[PDB]
Amino acid sequence: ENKVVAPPMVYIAGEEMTRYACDLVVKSWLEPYFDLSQWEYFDLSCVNRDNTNDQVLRDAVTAGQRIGAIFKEPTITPSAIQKKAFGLKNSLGSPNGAMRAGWNGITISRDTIHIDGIELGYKRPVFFERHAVGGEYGAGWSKVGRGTLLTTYLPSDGRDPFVVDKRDLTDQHNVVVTYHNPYDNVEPLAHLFFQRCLDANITPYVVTKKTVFKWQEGFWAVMKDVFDEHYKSRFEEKGLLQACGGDLQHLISDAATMQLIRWTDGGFGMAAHNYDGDMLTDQIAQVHRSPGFITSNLVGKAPDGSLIKEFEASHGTVSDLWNDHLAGKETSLNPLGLVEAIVGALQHAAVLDAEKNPDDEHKVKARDQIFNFTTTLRTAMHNTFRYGQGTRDMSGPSGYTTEDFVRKVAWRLQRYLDAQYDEAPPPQLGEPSRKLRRNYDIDEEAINGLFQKYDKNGDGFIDFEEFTRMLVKMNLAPLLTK
Amino acid sequence: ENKVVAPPMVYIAGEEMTRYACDLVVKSWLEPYFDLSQWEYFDLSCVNRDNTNDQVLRDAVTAGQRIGAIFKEPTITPSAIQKKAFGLKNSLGSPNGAMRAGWNGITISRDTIHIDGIELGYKRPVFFERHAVGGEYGAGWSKVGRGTLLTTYLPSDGRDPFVVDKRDLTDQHNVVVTYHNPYDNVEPLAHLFFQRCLDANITPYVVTKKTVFKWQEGFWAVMKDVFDEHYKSRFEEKGLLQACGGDLQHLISDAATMQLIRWTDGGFGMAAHNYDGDMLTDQIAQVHRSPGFITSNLVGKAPDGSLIKEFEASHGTVSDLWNDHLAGKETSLNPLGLVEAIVGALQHAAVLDAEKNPDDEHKVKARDQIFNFTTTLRTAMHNTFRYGQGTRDMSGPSGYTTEDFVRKVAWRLQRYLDAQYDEAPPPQLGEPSRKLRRNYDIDEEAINGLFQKYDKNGDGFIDFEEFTRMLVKMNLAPLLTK
């Protein structure tokens, strides 16, 4: 064994089907080739989080700032039923607040693609930057009765306390809501967003409700300033500002969610506030395929100012497939998002190892080894899917189980690492019918109803005319240029 | 000479094409049969609002409290350019805050229908209660720097000032936002909403994001408590809780916005917060022709306890047709929404007259006179549309001008009031192709792209399969139950 020593990396584990499948993937695709040992595991199981009163969470955050590259598994934010069943003494919420605080912010939700010949919802990649902090999700509130509410601001600027808002609550049933948006890291965000769009040949956009909530116009201002100063020239010089008329376009929240579903050939990126970005990314996810086919990557700033990158899949622990496994029924979990997050974490760990130790040879070379490996591992997994041996949500009921999918990808991976151009090339495909998706069984009787509805002619005479009627009746016909 | 005396009613006038067209409708359809004179006009033109520094709006509010029945025309909330041209020296905003304060609240957005046989988007009436007060639209905010923000609540319950939220703002560019919801009049709202859904055989629903925004859970509670206590029995007696499973259903606002577009059969009602209600009623408007086909009716409480009702169309002053009118080019403005508002205001004025003066004979029958009149007035307007002599956005290019339509409806109204059944009945119609809508021209080659290409299967040859997939790929196929 002369295996490569993987760079230091934080590894946060959860429970259930995703813990089982990540364990399977690391053992089959990584330990064959890597000395881990510099990985720093943390058990964020519900039970382990509760016994340590979340000291394992404070240790994961600490390890993350010091190391700066972290893969995290899906975790259970236990519901009351689940909190009782597990019997956790002192309920603890989502670890997200801890991580996003300890590491600074922004949350990249970009579509996953099988660049070797499986079409998905979007023909070309989509990027999305969901501002990691601020907004309604972090609001403080209280139900209050009669009186007056007073919002003061106390500057460290030495100046006098500021009356932000004062109001006279006449009712005996009120709710009051207060929150903030921190906007410093909007200019880092812009640089991350615009630059990654440059590299990818993506037309970028900014999405807000700034016309209606004027407190949001700061966001768009910084995005605009940074853009005009540093990237507009390079964007036109690549001819990407073309489908948006020469400048960075602002989209109001509610025209954004339409070009999402419309410009279905992809090749666009969007940046937005935390709440809006959550909603819009769920929407992009559904257009592309399912939630597991979207990235969920925190990018933040370490105290020293280096990049902290944390990677996640966009699904939970998948309890029902866990129960199927416990009762000996076969399961078929798509590991795509999980694998993508693991190789992102590993890649950034290698990058940080070289950046933290320049003037070290076998670290700028370890990085290049890592990137070549993750490239041929992607090939092994995409080709497996293309040979019809993907999991059952993509390859249909003849698709492999979780375990034989992992094993078959390891088989191709050991071969691909030694030339091995046997088999033959797998085929180009096309969207596996979305009905293969888990927990998506439609309503064939309803959709009968609606196609016969738009008839009034014969055996569904569409002949475009009905299509046009449909799309206007739908309120989805593209408007004109004007 | 013997015309009926209209009950007292406030009339708020605006500017431009709707002021001219309302003046014409009142002169042609009402003045023939009614002595107005007890109508109390207020000029809320931009110029008169700015010269009086909105004392005209404040007097209108006072008169509306005294009379309680108000028609208001669209008014201009002037844009900077428009404020320049008009030369208004102290900008004054929307009259909405004043009216909703002076009269209490909730904003009714219900679909308008041509009960004599022209189908539109929804087929059966849809009701919507948008909570008139509270929420994000009435927020205080500020740009703040480094420091600490402090939200105090000072009860008149005499107890100690309450720390709603305190937070430690580290950034140098922050925005802070605070707002409230008054929830007393939710139970008035419930009674208003549930009872009218009863009268109309509408299944009611409540829409919130209470699951993600816990402070909204009050809304669902009050609405539910009233329902279960005061209306559930009557709704099941009518078998209206059938498609919603026996009880009052709460919908998260993003499944609401799905059944909106889905249940195109109508026959449902929704109540929501001020902000969500704004967005969802814009969407209901779109499913059903255009925004001008949705009412906008304030309902509030006067000091005496009588209902205060203000009615508006859901469009503006229609500036572009005003430009055309001043240049002597003909215009064709659909007065449907404005008329629906005028006869609603007139009905409520008659109702208030009777309720405020019982032991008065010719007021309880003046009420019935008004209602008979408005019914034959609806028949005349609907029928004119069905004879193809409506305005051109409904009747295509052979439709009449604003002025010819008003004259033709006046002719039919005069004849109908004299038991004159000549002519011959107009036909049943069907949605006038929405391309006839003003300022709505489709990008037919884009929609080519989508039909000619996207659902291939040869030369057109769409039956199901591509329809079903189409609904799947856009994420608009109806799924499974829970």
Side-chain angles (χ1 to χ4, degrees):
Chain A
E1 165 258 14
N2 63 304
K3 288 193 243 156
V4 177
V5 188
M9 197 182 81
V10 185
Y11 189 118
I12 312 200
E15 336 182 19
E16 295 190 337
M17 186 71 196
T18 48
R19 176 176 53 190
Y20 167 76
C22 291
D23 204 299
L24 254 168
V25 165
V26 176
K27 278 173 178 146
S28 324
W29 306 356
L30 296 186
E31 294 182 16
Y33 309 94
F34 283 89
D35 172 9
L36 285 320
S37 78
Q38 279 184 337
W39 288 12
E40 280 163 72
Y41 286 75
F42 294 92
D43 174 10
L44 262 68
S45 154
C46 277
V47 200
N48 197 26
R49 289 187 62 199
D50 199 68
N51 296 337
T52 61
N53 199 42
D54 256 356
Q55 187 51 55
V56 73
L57 177 58
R58 322 193 45 241
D59 297 328
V61 176
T62 304
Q65 321 152 282
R66 176 244 306 186
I67 296 166
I70 163 172
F71 164 65
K72 161 182 193 288
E73 289 179 358
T75 57
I76 289 167
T77 301
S79 75
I81 301 180
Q82 195 170 14
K83 168 205 196 311
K84 203 165 188 271
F86 283 149
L88 318 171
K89 315 257 175 257
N90 157 285
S91 53
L92 292 152
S94 82
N96 287 334
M99 310 188 288
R100 288 145 168 49
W103 302 336
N104 267 69
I106 72 97
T107 291
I108 298 81
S109 283
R110 51 181 103 113
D111 66 318
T112 311
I113 306 270
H114 310 190
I115 191 173
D116 306 356
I118 295 181
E119 301 180 356
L120 299 173
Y122 287 100
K123 196 183 156 312
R124 328 204 312 274
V126 177
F127 294 170
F128 199 120
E129 303 287 1
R130 186 227 174 165
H131 188 52
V133 285
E136 288 88 353
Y137 288 154
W141 65 282
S142 186
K143 54 298 196 186
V144 305
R146 264 171 111 151
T148 43
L149 188 129
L150 192 280
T151 315
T152 318
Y153 167 74
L154 280 303
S156 304
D157 211 353
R159 287 189 245 197
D160 298 18
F162 195 34
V163 281
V164 184
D165 189 78
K166 171 174 177 165
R167 57 186 63 197
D168 41 349
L169 302 205
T170 44
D171 283 12
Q172 323 199 287
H173 194 172
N174 300 295
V175 278
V176 294
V177 183
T178 200
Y179 74 61
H180 77 288
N181 297 327
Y183 278 162
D184 289 346
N185 57 327
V186 174
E187 80 159 326
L189 189 152
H191 283 300
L192 287 171
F193 177 60
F194 295 129
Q195 187 63 55
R196 61 218 295 265
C197 281
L198 253 193
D199 301 329
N201 283 313
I202 295 292
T203 308
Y205 290 81
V206 176
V207 181
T208 76
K209 281 170 291 195
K210 73 140 154 86
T211 187
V212 163
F213 298 161
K214 309 255 184 175
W215 58 85
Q216 289 194 355
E217 145 79 43
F219 196 86
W220 163 259
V222 167
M223 301 288 295
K224 181 69 173 169
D225 171 70
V226 170
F227 186 76
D228 286 330
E229 185 162 349
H230 290 102
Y231 299 92
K232 174 176 184 177
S233 316
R234 309 198 244 155
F235 266 106
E236 31 187 28
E237 201 200 283
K238 295 181 111 286
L240 297 174
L241 302 184
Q242 303 264 180
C244 43
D247 302 28
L248 178 64
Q249 271 219 25
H250 178 278
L251 315 177
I252 285 288
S253 154
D254 263 17
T257 173
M258 346 183 285
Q259 191 251 284
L260 260 81
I261 316 177
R262 213 191 293 117
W263 197 18
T264 178
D265 287 335
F268 64 97
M270 294 182 176
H273 289 71
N274 180 294
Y275 179 49
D276 281 335
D278 199 29
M279 298 300 97
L280 289 172
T281 46
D282 294 348
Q283 298 200 4
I284 285 161
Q286 281 306 124
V287 176
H288 183 48
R289 189 155 181 84
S290 84
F293 293 77
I294 311 287
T295 279
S296 203
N297 303 156
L298 184 57
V299 175
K301 208 78 87 92
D304 68 22
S306 74
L307 281 313
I308 288 186
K309 290 196 178 174
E310 180 255 16
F311 299 75
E312 311 197 15
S314 279
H315 53 74
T317 71
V318 193
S319 308
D320 44 337
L321 285 198
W322 190 226
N323 301 331
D324 299 346
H325 178 264
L326 288 181
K329 296 164 243 231
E330 39 185 22
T331 70
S332 203
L333 177 70
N334 200 347
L336 250 191
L338 289 161
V339 175
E340 216 55 26
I342 296 164
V343 317
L346 179 63
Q347 282 166 0
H348 188 54
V351 160
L352 283 188
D353 210 19
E355 288 181 353
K356 289 170 183 271
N357 304 97
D359 223 278
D360 191 337
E361 46 103 35
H362 191 278
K363 275 194 174 176
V364 170
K365 166 254 164 191
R367 194 187 65 205
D368 301 330
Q369 265 181 331
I370 296 316
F371 273 88
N372 286 322
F373 172 81
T374 54
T375 290
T376 88
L377 180 169
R378 277 207 187 85
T379 310
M381 151 168 82
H382 295 170
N383 287 349
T384 299
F385 271 105
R386 293 166 80 186
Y387 287 135
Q389 312 164 345
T391 56
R392 272 158 190 171
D393 62 305
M394 290 274 288
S395 286
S398 324
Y400 288 10
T401 54
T402 308
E403 291 98 336
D404 302 332
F405 173 77
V406 171
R407 199 184 316 110
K408 184 63 71 188
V409 182
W411 177 72
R412 291 207 170 82
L413 199 276
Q414 186 220 309
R415 288 200 112 70
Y416 286 176
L417 287 185
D418 317 301
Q420 297 332 80
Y421 168 71
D422 268 328
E423 293 174 322
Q428 313 291 311
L429 310 184
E431 312 201 46
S433 153
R434 290 85 176 317
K435 322 156 120 163
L436 304 184
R437 298 169 55 183
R438 277 149 19 63
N439 301 313
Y440 177 118
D441 316 345
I442 66 170
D443 185 333
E444 197 253 5
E445 204 72 45
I447 50 91
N448 169 330
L450 298 94
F451 176 101
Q452 168 130 321
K453 164 158 259 281
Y454 294 47
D455 226 302
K456 144 92 141 163
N457 198 302
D459 64 297
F461 203 203
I462 294 124
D463 319 85
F464 163 81
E465 293 181 44
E466 277 193 333
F467 187 80
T468 325
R469 265 186 232 78
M470 184 168 69
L471 253 200
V472 305
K473 283 275 233 311
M474 290 226 201
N475 190 56
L476 195 161
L479 293 66
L480 198 33
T481 88
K482 319 143 180 212
Chain B
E1 185 279 320
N2 39 14
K3 310 188 211 167
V4 171
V5 175
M9 188 188 83
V10 180
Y11 191 122
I12 305 203
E15 327 195 36
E16 302 188 359
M17 186 66 198
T18 41
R19 170 164 65 174
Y20 160 78
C22 294
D23 165 84
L24 171 65
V25 157
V26 167
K27 276 171 184 154
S28 306
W29 302 356
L30 300 195
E31 281 187 10
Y33 313 94
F34 290 97
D35 175 15
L36 287 322
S37 93
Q38 265 174 341
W39 287 8
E40 213 161 314
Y41 286 52
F42 299 76
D43 169 26
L44 262 71
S45 165
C46 276
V47 172
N48 194 44
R49 279 179 68 197
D50 192 74
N51 296 332
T52 75
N53 189 324
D54 265 347
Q55 184 57 44
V56 69
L57 153 66
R58 235 163 295 111
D59 300 336
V61 171
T62 294
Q65 303 189 24
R66 172 232 314 178
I67 293 185
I70 323 158
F71 171 64
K72 173 197 183 300
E73 301 178 354
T75 59
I76 297 186
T77 312
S79 70
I81 304 177
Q82 219 183 192
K83 142 143 191 167
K84 185 102 162 114
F86 285 154
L88 314 164
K89 60 184 131 181
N90 55 337
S91 53
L92 282 151
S94 78
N96 288 323
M99 302 180 293
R100 287 152 179 50
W103 305 330
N104 310 355
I106 55 99
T107 300
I108 292 83
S109 287
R110 22 183 175 178
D111 64 317
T112 311
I113 283 190
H114 311 141
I115 292 331
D116 294 18
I118 303 183
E119 304 169 0
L120 303 163
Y122 271 109
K123 167 144 219 304
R124 193 153 79 263
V126 162
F127 292 173
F128 199 102
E129 293 303 352
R130 182 221 178 160
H131 194 198
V133 292
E136 296 83 344
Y137 281 157
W141 66 274
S142 183
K143 183 175 176 160
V144 298
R146 290 182 50 80
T148 37
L149 172 90
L150 191 270
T151 325
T152 325
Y153 166 65
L154 281 300
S156 292
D157 210 351
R159 311 178 118 235
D160 292 7
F162 197 23
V163 279
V164 178
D165 184 76
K166 152 170 191 344
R167 56 184 70 196
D168 37 355
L169 309 189
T170 87
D171 284 19
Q172 316 253 357
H173 181 14
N174 300 284
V175 293
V176 288
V177 184
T178 295
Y179 76 66
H180 77 286
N181 304 346
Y183 276 154
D184 285 342
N185 62 11
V186 176
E187 85 162 321
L189 188 157
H191 288 293
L192 283 179
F193 172 61
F194 292 129
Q195 186 72 47
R196 6 111 77 170
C197 293
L198 255 186
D199 303 333
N201 311 313
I202 297 310
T203 305
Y205 297 95
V206 189
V207 177
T208 71
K209 285 171 289 192
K210 93 207 180 86
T211 199
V212 177
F213 292 167
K214 294 295 201 305
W215 58 84
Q216 285 190 352
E217 151 79 48
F219 198 83
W220 166 245
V222 170
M223 297 292 291
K224 178 75 166 169
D225 163 59
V226 166
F227 182 73
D228 288 329
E229 181 171 342
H230 280 96
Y231 304 80
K232 182 175 186 181
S233 154
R234 298 207 285 292
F235 278 103
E236 37 204 5
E237 298 179 13
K238 295 176 78 98
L240 282 176
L241 315 177
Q242 313 306 109
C244 68
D247 300 25
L248 185 68
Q249 289 317 315
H250 172 274
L251 325 171
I252 67 102
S253 100
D254 315 70
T257 183
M258 286 294 105
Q259 160 198 48
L260 262 74
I261 326 162
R262 204 181 251 101
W263 202 25
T264 173
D265 225 319
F268 68 90
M270 298 190 173
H273 293 72
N274 185 290
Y275 175 58
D276 279 329
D278 199 32
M279 298 298 95
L280 297 167
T281 51
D282 291 350
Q283 277 154 175
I284 280 158
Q286 286 315 118
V287 176
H288 191 90
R289 194 141 221 91
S290 50
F293 288 69
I294 308 296
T295 65
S296 211
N297 303 344
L298 194 58
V299 182
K301 209 68 84 93
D304 61 319
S306 55
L307 250 12
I308 289 178
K309 283 182 174 161
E310 179 260 11
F311 295 71
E312 313 195 25
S314 282
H315 56 76
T317 60
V318 194
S319 309
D320 45 339
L321 300 208
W322 192 230
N323 281 329
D324 291 2
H325 182 259
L326 288 185
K329 338 178 176 103
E330 47 196 15
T331 70
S332 186
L333 170 79
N334 194 335
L336 191 273
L338 301 164
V339 166
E340 211 60 37
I342 290 163
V343 308
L346 172 68
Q347 284 172 1
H348 186 63
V351 161
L352 281 187
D353 204 30
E355 293 193 356
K356 283 160 178 277
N357 302 94
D359 309 21
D360 192 333
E361 45 100 30
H362 176 62
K363 268 189 184 183
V364 78
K365 90 126 184 193
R367 188 229 77 113
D368 299 334
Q369 275 171 321
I370 303 314
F371 278 89
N372 285 322
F373 177 82
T374 60
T375 289
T376 89
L377 182 289
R378 265 195 198 82
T379 312
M381 192 183 320
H382 292 342
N383 280 354
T384 296
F385 274 108
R386 309 158 78 187
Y387 290 119
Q389 298 163 342
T391 53
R392 296 174 183 156
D393 55 312
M394 293 289 296
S395 291
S398 61
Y400 287 7
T401 50
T402 310
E403 291 102 315
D404 286 347
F405 176 83
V406 173
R407 202 180 303 106
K408 184 63 75 188
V409 162
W411 173 72
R412 283 202 179 83
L413 191 271
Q414 166 52 241
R415 280 177 71 227
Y416 284 170
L417 290 172
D418 285 30
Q420 257 305 80
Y421 166 67
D422 300 29
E423 253 168 353
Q428 307 279 324
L429 296 186
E431 307 195 28
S433 75
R434 303 189 176 200
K435 321 201 237 169
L436 314 180
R437 298 179 41 186
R438 290 189 286 108
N439 313 314
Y440 183 105
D441 313 306
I442 59 176
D443 189 11
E444 158 77 1
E445 177 95 355
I447 295 96
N448 267 288
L450 315 192
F451 173 78
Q452 162 266 1
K453 189 66 80 185
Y454 207 46
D455 275 275
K456 157 59 191 27
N457 195 72
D459 51 274
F461 217 100
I462 304 168
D463 313 348
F464 253 93
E465 289 179 358
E466 309 117 280
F467 189 72
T468 47
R469 183 168 77 69
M470 180 146 270
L471 271 274
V472 186
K473 311 118 50 187
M474 339 172 94
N475 177 283
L476 295 324
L479 201 137
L480 172 166
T481 48
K482 95 84 199 173

